[PDB]
Amino acid sequence: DFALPINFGADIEYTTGANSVPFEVVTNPEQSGINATDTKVGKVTNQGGQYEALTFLLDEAIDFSGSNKTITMKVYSEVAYQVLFKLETGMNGERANEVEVSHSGNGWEELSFNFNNARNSFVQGDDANNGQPFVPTGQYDEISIFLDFAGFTAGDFYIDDIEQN
Ligand SMILES: OC[C@H]1O[C@@H](O[C@@H]2[C@@H](O)[C@H](O[C@@H]3[C@@H](O)[C@H](O)O[C@H](CO)[C@H]3O)O[C@H](CO)[C@H]2O)[C@H](O)[C@@H](O)[C@@H]1O
Numbered sequence: 001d002f003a004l005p006i007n008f009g010a011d012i013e014y015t016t017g018a019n020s021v022p023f024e025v026v027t028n029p030e031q032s033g034i035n036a037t038d039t040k041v042g043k044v045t046n047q048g049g050q051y052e053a054l055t056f057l058l059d060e061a062i063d064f065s066g067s068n069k070t071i072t073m074k075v076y077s078e079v080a081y082q083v084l085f086k087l088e089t090g091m092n093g094e095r096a097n098e099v100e101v102s103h104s105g106n107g108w109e110e111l112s113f114n115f116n117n118a119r120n121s122f123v124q125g126d127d128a129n130n131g132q133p134f135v136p137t138g139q140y141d142e143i144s145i146f147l148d149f150a151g152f153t154a155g156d157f158y159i160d161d162i163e164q165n
Pocket of ligand 1: 088144
């Protein structure tokens, strides 16, 4: 039931990782622009940790064996920063990989993470491969969303409609 596509507030039994930043499903406080029909959204509370992530353990792995390698997600920010969508190590040990895009800071933005242009996630002692291009082809059950990737911005942000296409 906690599988893509994720639209929060449908009595979703979400599962977060041990080190996840606070997350909770809240009535949409910005029923505005691109997300005006959404009545419930995900409230992400950054604490100002440099690489702090919202981490979900999915009931069903995302399958990247096909040509549908693009994850889209609505994100609300009034601050311009980088957003990272990260696949942690897959079900079969598939390499952790990520796409970094910009949020222009204009409230609700549809961000597009095309894993055709993914790179190897930082792993300690893997200098040769860290940040090298990579296209996932495997099954990934653990996803990590970084608001203000590599920055220290703290505060409440909103997230909804994580989908594969
Ligand atoms: O990539 C440049 C930079 O990367 C740093 O490594 C971070 C990882 O530490 C981070 O790991 C996440 C945790 O910080 C978070 O709290 O939990 C989740 C899962 O439990 C982790 O994925 O992930 C990001 C993105 O892949 C990495 O960049 C290096 O430590 C640093 O030396 C390097 O400069």
